[PDB]
Design a protein around this ligand. Sequence first.
Ligand SMILES: *[C@@H]1O[C@H](CO)[C@@H](O[C@@H]2O[C@H](CO)[C@@H](O[C@@H]3O[C@H](CO[C@H]4O[C@H](CO)[C@@H](O)[C@H](O)[C@@H]4O)[C@@H](O)[C@H](O[C@H]4O[C@H](CO)[C@@H](O)[C@H](O)[C@@H]4O)[C@@H]3O)[C@H](O)[C@H]2NC(C)=O)[C@H](O)[C@H]1NC(C)=O
Ligand SMILES: *[C@@H]1O[C@H](CO)[C@@H](O[C@@H]2O[C@H](CO)[C@@H](O[C@@H]3O[C@H](CO[C@H]4O[C@H](CO)[C@@H](O)[C@H](O)[C@@H]4O)[C@@H](O)[C@H](O)[C@@H]3O)[C@H](O)[C@H]2NC(C)=O)[C@H](O)[C@H]1NC(C)=O
Ligand SMILES: *[C@@H]1O[C@H](CO)[C@@H](O[C@@H]2O[C@H](CO)[C@@H](O)[C@H](O)[C@H]2NC(C)=O)[C@H](O)[C@H]1NC(C)=O
Ligand SMILES: *[C@@H]1O[C@H](CO)[C@@H](O[C@@H]2O[C@H](CO)[C@@H](O)[C@H](O)[C@H]2NC(C)=O)[C@H](O)[C@H]1NC(C)=O
Ligand SMILES: *[C@@H]1O[C@H](CO)[C@@H](O)[C@H](O)[C@H]1NC(C)=O
Length: 454
Amino acid sequence: VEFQINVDLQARYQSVDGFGCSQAFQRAEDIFGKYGLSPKNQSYVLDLMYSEERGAGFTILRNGIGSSNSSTSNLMNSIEPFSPGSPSSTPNYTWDHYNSGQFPLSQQARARGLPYIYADAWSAPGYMKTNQDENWSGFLCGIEGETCPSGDWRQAYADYLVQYVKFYAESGVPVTHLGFLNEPQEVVSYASMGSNGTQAAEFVKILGQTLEREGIDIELTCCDGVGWSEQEAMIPGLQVVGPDGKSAEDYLSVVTGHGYSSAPTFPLSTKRRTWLTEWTDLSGAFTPYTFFADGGAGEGMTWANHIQTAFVNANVSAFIYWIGAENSTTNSGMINLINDEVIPSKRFWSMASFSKFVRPNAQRVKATSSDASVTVSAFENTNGVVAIQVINNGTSAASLTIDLGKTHKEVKKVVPWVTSNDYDLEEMSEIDVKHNSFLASVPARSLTSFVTEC
Ligand SMILES: *[C@@H]1O[C@H](CO)[C@@H](O[C@@H]2O[C@H](CO)[C@@H](O[C@@H]3O[C@H](CO[C@H]4O[C@H](CO)[C@@H](O)[C@H](O)[C@@H]4O)[C@@H](O)[C@H](O[C@H]4O[C@H](CO)[C@@H](O)[C@H](O)[C@@H]4O)[C@@H]3O)[C@H](O)[C@H]2NC(C)=O)[C@H](O)[C@H]1NC(C)=O
Ligand SMILES: *[C@@H]1O[C@H](CO)[C@@H](O[C@@H]2O[C@H](CO)[C@@H](O[C@@H]3O[C@H](CO[C@H]4O[C@H](CO)[C@@H](O)[C@H](O)[C@@H]4O)[C@@H](O)[C@H](O)[C@@H]3O)[C@H](O)[C@H]2NC(C)=O)[C@H](O)[C@H]1NC(C)=O
Ligand SMILES: *[C@@H]1O[C@H](CO)[C@@H](O[C@@H]2O[C@H](CO)[C@@H](O)[C@H](O)[C@H]2NC(C)=O)[C@H](O)[C@H]1NC(C)=O
Ligand SMILES: *[C@@H]1O[C@H](CO)[C@@H](O[C@@H]2O[C@H](CO)[C@@H](O)[C@H](O)[C@H]2NC(C)=O)[C@H](O)[C@H]1NC(C)=O
Ligand SMILES: *[C@@H]1O[C@H](CO)[C@@H](O)[C@H](O)[C@H]1NC(C)=O
């Protein structure tokens, strides 16, 4: 045996909620033909993203709760664009059955089986904030240390987020996960809003209490920090048990962070599930076809490794890329649209390799490799399908011996699915398994998903 891979289904780790992307800042409109995409390719892109059989079967869609009072440039417009005059005044809410294209997108994703919709606000509306502006950070009026002459807007913001979730549910598209901050560290020209851990915790408790009063069942998140270390720094604040004997962590279902300022390479110190909720290559490079060339930020293998590391080393339950599909020739999205043209990147195919076979409620299980040139991850689905991801970073093909150890069902067949410079997500011939062990060659510089049958 040249390379030994051992999988142990009796050594079990975190659950998986899934994989996906956002179509925020009007990028959902691109999929529906804003820049000339044909009806054929609109349907094709939705199948690539959300069909388990025809595509990646993404299971999480992250939508923006818009803060803007218009839909100019790439703004996401708000359900409450204009101040009601005071926090206690009756709000005027507008529902356009659109949400910058994210509503019809959510309908199309759900039609193809998508279970999880994560609605996240980048900012409260400007009139609820210290700077009276959705932009350039600022704080929710009434949060600890941040008073405003117009009064305390904390309950108004909670009621606003509840009303967004209600419009979605009433329109047949329930939201499963809810967040109220994005990158609270960042002071930027676009929708942004500040909070440290204790300021975030204060609002988590108000929002959780509001949802419980309304009888709405939804998973709360915090805080989409700009990097993994930056999110870790907020967790002590979320864990402070207040006078009432509750922490923010008691109300939270998921702790969320981004990969930009620091990558998900270590476990966060929360007792909750964690999600990597945004990450991409923002360099402005264009790397659609490269799985491996020289370790560029946009290469397929870079992203296969980011995903594998997030699950094995950072203990995440989900991985959400930034934009799925957009009219651009950069690496910001997984799928480049060029008017009526669809170019799925190797970053897309790396995501697809995981997402297609690691279905919601899968559990990560122990998987080891005898050699640092081959890195491995493994998950058992609730239907018993085992999906093993192998990255071969050798310059030659690697002959693997893969032992599945002790299992309930004797495994009889396994199917390899390959992603490389030569292959997108290519199904290879089934391999016969004997005594829960099999041999497989994997190409140089490749990702292979080995998927067990029945
Ligand atoms: C599989 O094994 C291979 C080796 O065989 C490893 O490859 C090396 O991968 C690293 C990254 O992990 C590579 O280093 C990075 O290269 C990037 C691309 O560089 C080229 O293109 C850019 C942009 O045009 C040029 O600027 C540059 O001169 C090169 O022409 C760089 O963009 C990266 O830079 C960034 O990160 C560094 C380090 O943190 C920062 O200092 C920089 O400022 C910047 O943010 C980086 O240098 C390296 O080139 C690869 N070597 C080879 C021989 O290919 C893989 O890592 C390995 N994969 C796995 C998953 O283990
Ligand atoms: C829907 O999206 C499709 C996918 O993008 C569109 O089809 C593509 O249209 C472009 C023109 O905009 C064609 O581009 C040319 O490609 C050739 C090279 O061709 C070949 O190699 C590819 C890659 O493996 C292969 O799939 C092709 O079949 C060819 O063998 C260049 O010489 C040209 O300069 C230009 O780049 C694409 O080839 C074409 N792709 C496919 C798969 O058809 C399509 O037009 C969109 N609309 C509709 C209504 O279908
Ligand atoms: C609509 O939103 C815009 C953008 O946030 C608001 O404009 C800002 O208002 C604040 C407060 O006066 C200023 O500090 C910013 O400079 C403004 N930004 C821009 C780009 O103009 C605007 O007030 C909002 N309109 C209403 C009616 O609420
Ligand atoms: C990996 O993440 C999981 C959550 O997905 C962590 O699981 C929690 O474990 C604590 C301590 O044993 C329990 O009190 C919680 O009930 C678990 N949460 C869930 C949702 O199951 C696990 O601790 C994390 N691992 C590491 C090494 O940090
Ligand atoms: C969409 O993307 C292509 C490629 O970047 C670009 O050339 C084109 O102008 C964009 N389409 C528009 C604005 O119609």
